[PDB]
Paper text:
Heterologous expression in Streptomyces lividans TK21 and an in vivo analysis revealed that TleC catalyses the ‘reverse' prenylation of the cyclic dipeptide (−)-indolactam V (1) at the C-7 position of the indole ring with geranyl pyrophosphate (GPP) (C10) to produce lyngbyatoxin A (2), with the C19R configuration, as in the case of LtxC15. MpnD also catalyses the ‘reverse' prenylation of 1 at the C-7 position, with DMAPP (C5) to yield pendolmycin (3). The overall structures of TleC and MpnD adopt the ABBA-fold, which consists of ten antiparallel β-strands assembled into a circular β-barrel, surrounded by a ring of solvent-exposed α-helices, as observed in the structures of indole PTs and aromatic PTs222324252627. In contrast to typical indole PTs that exhibit broad substrate specificities towards the prenyl acceptors but with strict specificities towards the prenyl donors, it is remarkable that the indolactam-specific TleC and MpnD exhibited unusually relaxed substrate specificities towards the prenyl donors and accepted different chain lengths (from C5 to C25) of prenyl pyrophosphate in vitro.
The gene cluster from S. blastmyceticus encodes an indolactam PT, TleC, which is a 42-kDa protein consisting of 391 amino acids that shares 40% and 38% identities with LtxC from the cyanobacterium Moorea producens and MpnD from the deep sea bacterium M. thermotolerans, respectively. S. blastmyceticus TleC and M. thermotolerans MpnD were heterologously expressed in Escherichia coli as His-tagged fusion proteins and purified to homogeneity by Ni-chelate affinity chromatography. TleC exhibited 23-fold higher kcat/KM value for the C10 prenylation activity over the C5 prenylation activity.
Residue numbers in the entry: 36 to 63, 71 to 178, 184 to 388
Amino acid sequence: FDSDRYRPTDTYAEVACDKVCRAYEGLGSLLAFLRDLTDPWGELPVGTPPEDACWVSIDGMPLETSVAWAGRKAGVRLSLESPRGPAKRRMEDGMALTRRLAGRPGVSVDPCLRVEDLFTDDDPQGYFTIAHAVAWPRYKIFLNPAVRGREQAAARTEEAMIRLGLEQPWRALTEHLGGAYGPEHEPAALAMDLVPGDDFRVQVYLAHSGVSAEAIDAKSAVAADHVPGSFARALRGINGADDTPEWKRKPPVTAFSFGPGRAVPGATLYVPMIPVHGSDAAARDRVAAFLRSEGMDAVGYEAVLDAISDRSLPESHTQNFISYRGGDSPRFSVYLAPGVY
């Protein structure tokens, strides 16, 4: 525990509330909602870190704040994962939360419940099983295809894709990638928007170990929204040399998005921040320079960083990823550890 902003007795839910409010401030009762949402661990004091770091945040907190720009608008999102242990109890906490979201105003958890058995187990492996996010409310769930080892990740992902009706765009991706999944494009996570109908989306996050910016770009050429070279230019550009130990320890990620009635996936690039960059200030300078050269809003990005961060940025290590899509309908997001641990 290491905070100038929070006392050790502040609760997880109170930190969550504070971060969400400050993110809105940077963009220019909630507490009640979040206590309920994080029931019952949301009441735990933040001063006592979990036994096992949460996957959801690079500082191991059970909370991660996100701000997303798209279609000339910005929105705040919050990711959550139980800090409880051991892994099986953490998993069951998440299962419980999914079921508590069912029947919330616009929610559909049916697609999640039809593949849930694939990403849960009585003896789970890997650094997580279940996590969620809320956006302002729509919800999503994150699942670990490596719950029973990495070697089964592609198979488990594929079977879920099939159950969900998305075999065709999943086939398109799989063939584009050469027909097999390896460390070059490894299924590291799945997400689902818990909504019914055409707006339903599943994202498959592929990690890219030991490949160049150009090769990563080319893996996206099957995407509905592929802008040739744009991923290569973001990666080379923001993150420079691909041979640093820090690059190799946290490789880039592409989120492929799948929707009903869509023959091919969309693609969004996830650019690792800390620890590829030495601090949030260094990462900020380079991300801002890239945003400007793309004509995107670097001021709003920096305003959010400033509003939400608890330490001066050269001493702050809270940016996990930024995400980026170029072209006519550009997207940018930043994902932030609370920076409490």
